[PDB]
Amino acid sequence: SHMENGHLAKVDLTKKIESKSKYNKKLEKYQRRLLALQQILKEEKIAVMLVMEGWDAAGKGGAIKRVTEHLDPRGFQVDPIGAPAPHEKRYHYLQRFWRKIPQYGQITIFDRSWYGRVLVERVEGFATKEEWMRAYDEINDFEKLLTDDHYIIGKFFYHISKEEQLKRFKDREKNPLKRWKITDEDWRNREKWDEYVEAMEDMFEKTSKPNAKWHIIESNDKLYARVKTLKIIISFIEDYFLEHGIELPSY
């Protein structure tokens, strides 16, 4: 099929970090670096937008936590994106995202995003064929608007196996503290798994751009995922500084 040579099928899900302590050392290393870059970001009038998509339970929440753990909370916002509330449905679909875009020197992090227009909204049919079919180009224009200006955009997709999802779904059910986090909605979405793959493959084809790359994170192991998120970010910020003459902190 096309799903046999698709992006998600080609992903090596064996990736991992075996030692918990060598994880902690790498995290703290990358956390230090990211904080140093946050100071240069604040001064230099550059805004960062991070988009995080993926399967339910795939560890977007976990990754964001590690990205922001030791950042200054005054310099970042985390925006968790669900279904449009009734007040948002009265405006064009992008209006609610435009209100959340960071000011210069600031980071906004999207737990889900506008990409819902071509995922959940497509598969559940909340958006018509015409709406989701034109939306890829709308989303690209939106990204380019900001990147042609002084925004940096990074997009991450956390990929896990269907079997790993089930293991995590079961653990969220057994733990009382995590029992919110798993709902009938979560199970419904796993049932549509293969429709989602089709939709996610189209998204990687249509909306992976030089100014706004999709990064597919192998996420069966949370440790690898979290550390690779930090690594990719640090890298695309440094690349941006080097390109535009800004001076890096200890590189």
Site for a second copy, rule CB under 8 A: 28, 31-32, 35, 70, 72-74, 80, 82, 86-87, 90-95, 98-99, 101, 103-105, 134, 138, 141, 145-146, 148-149, 151, 176-178, 180
Residue closer to a second copy (CB basis): 220 or 229:
229
Minimal distance, residue 121 CB to a second copy, in Å: 14
SS (H, E, C) 137-184: HHHHHHHHHHHHCCEEEEEEEEECCHHHHHHHHHHHHHCHHHCCCCCH
Cβ of residue 32: shortest distance to a second copy, in angstroms? Answer: 5
Judged by CB, which is closer to a second copy: 141, or 239?
141
Q: In whole angstroms, how close is the CB of 166 to a second copy at the nearest point? A: 22
Residues 110/139, Cβ–Cβ less than 8 Å: no
Q: Give the tokens for residue 93.
A: 């679909």
Q: Which residue lies nearer to a second copy by CB, 200 or 237?
A: 237
Longest Cα pair distance anywhere in the chain, in angstroms? 52
**DSSP characters for 53-121?**
EESTTSSHHHHHHHHHTTS-GGGEEEE---SPPTTTTTS-TTHHHHTTPPPTT-EEEESS-GGGGGTHH
CB of 188 to a second copy, least distance (A): 19
**Two tokens at 2?**
């096309």
Q: Which is nearer to a second copy, 108 or 220 (CB)?
A: 108
Please answer whether residues 117 and 93 qualify as being in contact, where contact means their C-beta atoms are separated by less than 8 angstroms: yes
Phi/psi region, residue 110 (left: phi>0; alpha: psi -120 to 50; beta: rest), is beta
CB of 137 to a second copy, least distance (A): 9
Nearer to a second copy, 7 or 151 (CB): 151
Shortest distance in whole angstroms from residue 72 CB to a second copy: 5
Query: Of 18 and 177, which CB lies nearer to a second copy in the complex structure?
Result: 177
Cα angle value 214/220/226 (rounded, 5°) = 60
